[PDB]
Specification:
By secondary structure, this protein is mainly α. It has helices at about 5-15, 35-50, 65-75. α1 crosses α2. The protein is globular and about 30 Å long. The relative contact order is 0.20. Keywords: Fatty acid biosynthesis, Fatty acid metabolism, Lipid biosynthesis, Lipid metabolism, Phosphopantetheine, Phosphoprotein, Signal.
Length: about 80
């Protein structure tokens, strides 16, 4: 359990093995690294889909920032 980064590394690695060294920029996920809108939306969809939450259009607008990310996982998922 290493913050949202955990599930974030499993979704980005299972969706498109890339360098997370630019994912956790504490800025944006699809606005910082500039990976891809559809791509980022894919891995993200898997994160929540597995977390069994009620997110959809809030994830992409939350996980984008390390702050909102760990906040969307801590507020929802409680282990």
């Amino acid at each position: 359990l290493k913050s949202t980064f955990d599930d974030i590394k499993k979704i980005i690695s299972k969706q498109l093995s890339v360098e997370e060294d630019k994912i956790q920029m504490n800025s944006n996920f699809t606005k910082d690294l500039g990976a891809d809108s559809l791509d980022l939306v894919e891995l993200i969809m898997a994160l929540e889909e597995k977390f069994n939450v009620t997110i959809s259009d809030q994830d992409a607008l939350k996980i984008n920032t390390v702050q909102d990310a760990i906040d969307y996982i801590e507020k929802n998922n409680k282990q």
